[PDB]
Amino acid sequence: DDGMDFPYLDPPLICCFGAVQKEFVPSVRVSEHQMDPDIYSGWKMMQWNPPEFGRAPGGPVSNVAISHVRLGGRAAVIGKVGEDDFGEELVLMMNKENVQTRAVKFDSNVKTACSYMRVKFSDDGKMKMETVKEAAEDSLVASELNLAVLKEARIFHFNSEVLTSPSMNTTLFRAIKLSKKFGGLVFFDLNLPLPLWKSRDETREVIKQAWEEANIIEVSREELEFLLDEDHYERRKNYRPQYYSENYEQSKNRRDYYHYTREEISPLWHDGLKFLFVTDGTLRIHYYAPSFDGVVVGTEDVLITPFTCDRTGSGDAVVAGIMRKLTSHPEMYEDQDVLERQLRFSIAAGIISQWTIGAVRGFPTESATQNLKEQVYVPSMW
Amino acid sequence: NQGTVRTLLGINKECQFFLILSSSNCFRIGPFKGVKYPKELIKKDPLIPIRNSFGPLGTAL
Amino acid sequence: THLKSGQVLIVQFDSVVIRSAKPYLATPGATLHGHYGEIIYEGDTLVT
Amino acid sequence: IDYRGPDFHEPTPNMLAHLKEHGKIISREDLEKL
Amino acid sequence: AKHVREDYLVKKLSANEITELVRGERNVPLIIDFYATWCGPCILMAQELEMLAVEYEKNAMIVKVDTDDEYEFARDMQVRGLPTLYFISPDPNKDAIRTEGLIPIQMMRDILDNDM
């Protein structure tokens, strides 16, 4: 596919492959604390004290694209929607905020967000469900791939949800092959769906093919300890010396911000990797490069507005800011100082994104993000 | 949550409190450098690898 | 090493345990509240 | 203004109706007197 | 107890009760809601379901399941996200519907009217 006359526009395009959905929270586990089964007026008390996996919960890829374009970048989305009212309103919502929809395919065979299953009562009385007809979002075939977004886009971003369906596995791998043939990077976000939180070995087997093709990988703190060892990294966190502390900081019982050494993340490292990001919410971002590694320090505040705080969608803003600063500044790859300086913009965006109800309602602007970054960080850092 | 007892006592009894010293009260200062050699050692007469140290005179069974 | 506040507890070959403390400068004509080794709680006064 | 919602207390119960136990209708009161 | 009306119409049921409801004979469409307290967008879903349970007085049955209580059962039902609704037809010939995300109430009405 070679049709073009003039050079591409200034902000490099971003490729966002996945499923278009509204207010979706993939990463679900068992939270220790519950706040009443009926009264939803008190559920907001679980946003001040998150269950340590929903601290910065990522969402769909459309949320990431919207947050990226709202931060001053340019994004395009590949996906399929049905010929319904909901499908026609999702594309309207994405279009209203300058997200390119040249690669969104409308079809009438399937309905948006609706999938037909079948009850399959097994031995004992435990019911099951088998997908008879797939939902519209996860029904994209490799033939209807826009060979213009892939050529233009410089970063290919996708999440692990597409690894839970058969057809999108092949479609995603074909898109990855095309984008790599055209010279674009591959950004992997590991927002694991519920079924992938079953066992470490099964998930590692599932995501290995996608993991080995990624150039940049972003995972949460729990999504890394789960992938390496949950029991060991939970025993190490809750440990206090029997007699005497060690330095002095250990004598203050502060929170545990452990910077994993390069010999612990080695099983998850390969030659093609250019960056590994581990985000402990908006608190800290550990970055690992081929020749250096470090930690960027940040903060959070949801008690500043206890009645309009909603952590959903902050991880998408963090990832979108990371991508925006990666594409804007191409010298961050081999400069640790510039890397640390440009990684506080993402922290500011993630902090702002937790101050309002709704994932897409309150994604921050670039000017607001810069304002918060400069107001929180000392002039020497910013 | 462990701790070491610390009994004030001192052969005095007015209200008799007592303290618990944990790892959060006391810490360790990092490694440094200093001299630690002060000895008056003698000459060994190793027998069955149990030592028979004697300095001035010969072996004295 | 920039030692912290406290009283040296252990004098090992290359390390020291400090046990922490909190100095309070007191001027002449001041009123210490308590005998030696008086158990001081969280809020009670020390000197006027 | 949509009441219920996340930032409003539970609906205020009618005080007479809220007294489920320590309150009886006139018919039952008349019946129990004889 | 018939003296003061219940504030909330949706009744929370365990996994076994839901299995009995789906297996047993039914004459009205069934709605199964998956939710958790720590969930962000699930407050709005709870409010919309509460509103929907009033318009459909006796022509539908609406229940909810807490994934913090029944996690394996939710995983078995092919749930890959919290704001999930299951529509069950009153007849065994027609298959069930799974909807993901914060769907509008009008599309819910269309789902259990024109497709159930």
Q: What is the 3-state secondary structure (H, E, C) of chain A?
A: CCCCCCCCCCCCEEEEECCCCCCCCCCCCCCCCCCCCCCHHHCCHHHHCCCCCCCCCCCCHHHHHHHHHHCCCEEEEEEEEECCHHHHHHHHHHHCCCCECCCEEEECCCCCCEEEEEECCCCCCCCCEEEEECCCCCCCCHHHCCCCHHHHCCEEEEEHHHHHCHHHHHHHHHHHHHHHHCCCEEEEECCCCHHHHCCHHHHHHHHHHHHCCCCEEEEECHHHHHHHCHHHHHHHHCCCCCCCCCCCHHHCCCCCCCCCCCCCCHHHCCCCCCEEEEEECCCEEEEECCCCEEEEECCCCCCCCCCCCCCCCHHHHHHHHHHHHHHHCCCHHHCHHHHHHHCHHHHHHHHHCCCCCCCCCCCCCHHHHHHHHHHHCCCCCC
CA distance B1 to B24: 10
Q: Is C2 on the interface with A (CB under 8 A)?
A: no
The residues of E annotated as belonging to the active site are 39, 42
| Cβ separation B24–A245 shorter than 8 A | yes
For D5, nearest residue in chain A (alpha carbons): A41
- Whole-Å CA distances, A189 to A57, A66, B44, E23: 12, 16, 69, 39
* Cβ atoms of A39 and D5 closer than 8 Å: no
Bridge-partner residues for E61, per DSSP? E30
Residue in C with minimal Cα distance to A245:
C17
CA proximity to E105, closest of E49, E31, E34: E49
Q: Do chains D and E touch (3 or more CB pairs under 8 A)?
A: yes
Question: Using what technique was this structure determined?
Answer: cryo-EM
In whole angstroms, give the CA distance from residue E47 to residue E8.
Answer: 10
3-state secondary structure of C44: coil
Q: Name chain E's partners: 3 or more CB pairs within 8 A.
A: A, D
Helices and strands (H and E) in chain D: how many: 2, 0
Q: Which residue has the tokens 């949460």?
A: A220
Interchain contact A248–C (C-beta under 8 A): yes
Separate counts of helices (H) and strands (E) for chain E = 4, 5
What are the phi and psi torsion angles at E97 (to 5°)? -125, 135
* Helix, strand and coil in chain C, % to nearest 5: 0, 10, 90
Q: Tell me if residue E44 falls in helix, strand or coil.
A: helix
Task: Judge E/A contact: 3 or more CB pairs < 8 A.
Answer: yes
Question: Do A200 and A259 touch, CB atoms closer than 8 A?
Answer: no
Helix axes E42-55, E105-114, angle to 10 degrees: 50
* AA letter at A180: K
> Which residues does residue A278 pair with via DSSP β-bridges, in sequence order?
A219, A286
- Among A54, A299, A351, A348, residue whose Cα is nearest residue A191: A54
Q: B26 contacts in C (CB within 8 Å)?
A: 6, 9, 17-20
Q: Where are the alpha helices (DSSP H) in chain E?
A: 15-23, 42-55, 71-76, 105-114
Q: Are C21 and B25 in contact (CB under 8 A)?
A: no
Burial of A303 (0-12, 13-18, 19+ CB in 10 A): exposed
Of A39, A43, A44, Cβ closest to residue D10: A39
B26 vs C18: CB contact, 8 Å cut-off?
A: yes
Residue E34 near residue E68, CB atoms below 8 Å: no
**Residue A370: C-alpha distances to residues A41, A178, A318, E83 (Å):** 34, 35, 14, 33
Torsion sign (Cα): A348, A349, A351, A355: positive
Answer yes or no: are the C-beta atoms of C14 and B22 closer than 8 Å: no
B29 with C37: Cβ contact below 8 A: no
Nearest residue to E85 (alpha-carbon basis) of E68, E69, E65: E65
Cα–Cα distance for residue pair A313/A309, rounded to 1 Å: 11
CB atoms within 10 A of CB E75: 16
Q: Is B5 helix (H, G, I), strand (E, B) or coil?
A: strand
CA distance B17 to C34: 14
Backbone φ/ψ region at E78: left (φ over 0), alpha (ψ -120 to 50), beta? left
Residue with tokens 């559920």: A43
Q: Note the resolution in Å, 1 decimal.
A: 3.2
Least CA distance to E107: which residue of chain A? A86
CA dist A62 and A75 (Å) reads 10
What is the distance between the alpha carbons of residues E82 and D8, in angstroms, rounded to a whole number?
24
Q: Please list every residue in chain A whose beta carbon sits closer than 8 Å to the beta carbon of residue D3.
A: none
A62 within 8 A of A92, measured Cβ to Cβ: no
Q: Identify which of A92, A97, A22, A25 has the alpha carbon closest to the alpha carbon of residue A66.
A: A97
Q: Are A65 and A99 in contact (CB under 8 A)?
A: yes
D7 touches chain A (CB under 8 A): yes
Write out the two tokens for A368: 């607001």
**A252 contacts in C (CB within 8 Å)?**
none
**Token output for E51:** 């509103």
CA distance A261 to chain B (A): 22
B24 CA: distance to closest CA in chain C (Å) = 9
- Identity of residue E88: I
Largest CA distance in chain A: 72
CB A320, CB A67: distance < 8 Å = yes
Order across the sheet with E84-88: list the strands.
A129-133, A114-119, E96-100, E84-88, E30-35, E61-66, E11-12
Beta carbons of B33 and C14 less than 8 Å apart: yes
Please name which of E77, E93, E95, E2 lies closest in space to residue E33, comparing C-alpha atoms: E77
- What torsion do the CA atoms of A248, A253, A254, A259 make, to the nearest 10 degrees? 70
Distance separating alpha carbons of residues E47 and E64, to the nearest angstrom: 12
Q: Burial, A113: exposed, middle or buried (Cβ in 10 Å; 0-12, 13-18, 19+)? A: buried
What's the maximum distance between 2 C-alpha atoms anywhere in chain C? 43
For residue E68 the two structure tokens come to 């913090």
Contact E80 A194 (CB under 8 A): yes
Per DSSP, the three-state class of E111 is helix
Distance, CA of A314 to CA of A347 (rounded, Å):
10
State how far the Cα of C8 lies from the Cα of B36, in Å rounded to an integer.
18
DSSP-derived letter for residue E87 is E
**Residue pair E95/E29 in contact by the 8 Å Cβ criterion:** no
Closest among A107, A94, A158, A160 to A133, alpha carbons compared: A107
**H-type alpha helices, chain C:** none
Question: Between β-strands A129-133 and A114-119, what pairing exists: parallel, antiparallel or unpaired?
Answer: antiparallel
**CB atoms near residue A271 (< 10 Å):** 6
Chain D: give the shortest CA distance to residue E77, in Å: 29
